[PDB]
């Protein structure tokens, strides 16, 4: 997964040279999901 939608909240996994339009809907905010990287945070 690379990117996700706003309303449908569906994954796109698109690449460059592609329109930012969503496929399920015309709504195209096109959020980007969290990185695969493991993240450390301490309660301090």
């Amino acid at each position: 997964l690379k990117y996700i939608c706003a309303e449908c909240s569906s994954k796109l996994s698109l690449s460059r040279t592609d329109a930012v339009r969503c496929k399920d809907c015309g709504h195209r905010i096109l959020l980007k999901a969290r990185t695969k990287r493991l993240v450390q945070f301490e309660a301090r």
Partner: protein
């Protein structure tokens, strides 16, 4: 060309930093190249006096069709002595 002092390893292949990764000091968050008639980068580094976590990132197209990006960075401010109340 002229790149910034920020570390470019964090940036993804699309050139945009994903949420959940730290950006600190002058670390770049948006990777920009401004070709004219060699890549001639024109990125926007992070503020030197700011540190935090990239909270959200949004990519859209403006009315002209050009690509628009908005990157929200989150940090926690705990009270210190100099804090005003």
């Amino acid at each position: 060309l002229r790149m910034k002092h920020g570390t470019y390893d964090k940036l993804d292949d699309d050139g945009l930093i994903a949420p959940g990764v730290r950006v600190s000091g002058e670390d770049v968050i948006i990777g920009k190249t401004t070709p004219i008639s060699s890549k001639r980068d024109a990125s926007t580094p992070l503020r030197s006096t700011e540190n935090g976590i990239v909270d959200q990132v949004l990519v859209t197209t403006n009315q002209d069709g050009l690509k628009f990006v908005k990157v929200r960075v989150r940090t926690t401010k705990i009270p210190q002595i100099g804090d005003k109340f």
